[PDB]
Design a binder for this molecule. Sequence first.
Ligand SMILES: OC[C@H]1O[C@@H](O[C@H]2[C@H](O)[C@@H](O)[C@H](O)O[C@@H]2CO)[C@H](O)[C@@H](O)[C@H]1O
Length: 239
Amino acid sequence: ESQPDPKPDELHKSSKFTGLMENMKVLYDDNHVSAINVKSIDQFLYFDLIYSIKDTKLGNYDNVRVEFKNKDLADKYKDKYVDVFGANYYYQCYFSKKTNDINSHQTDKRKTCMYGGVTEHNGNQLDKYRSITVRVFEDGKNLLSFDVQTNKKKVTAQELDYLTRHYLVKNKKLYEFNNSPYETGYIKFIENENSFWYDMMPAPGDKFDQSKYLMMYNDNKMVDSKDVKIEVYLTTKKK
Ligand SMILES: OC[C@H]1O[C@@H](O[C@H]2[C@H](O)[C@@H](O)[C@H](O)O[C@@H]2CO)[C@H](O)[C@@H](O)[C@H]1O
């Protein structure tokens, strides 16, 4: 069980962020990118892939740019049929501008951007959703547990993360417009000796960089739905 647990002073303090929690909230509200059995259709930079995924409700986007940590990840998934799932942003998002020569590009009307959140479709399917347990702790006490479901054998940490936080925003007011009732918090995934966590709170300051925050998912970290367990540790802001 190692990826050093955070030392209490290591975590971002929500009281140190003085600039609109709504921008964090939106990433984990009901909207998100999801598609099954799609194939990249273009590329803007050598470390990304462009997908033809239409916003199936709000009609907010027609193309989604998936950015990876490096060229390898983009190469691996180029041309392959994948499922996509993840938190997207719009504000600092941009790519291609047109189907121009020299500058390899394409994409017309309504774009969105995201990091990682990709898995091979083929051979990664289960008929019969697997249920992953989430145990949340508030100041040290296991106050509740809820389930998250995925029908993927291999699932990105991004998806389990979004799933978990989406429930907490709805039932625990994890993030609110201008604040959060929690001072610190982190999501811990556990497979085996392998455990890793993400800080759920925004960095100190007056502004939150959605793009920079969502960047932690660019490694396309995957996990096996059969071996994972998730624990959330929240601490209450000095009442
Ligand atoms: O069993 C062969 C049969 O599968 C259908 O697909 C179904 C599948 O039967 C069911 O278990 C699953 O839950 O939903 C699928 C619907 O896509 C196919 O429609 C049929 O063409 C055969 O392929």
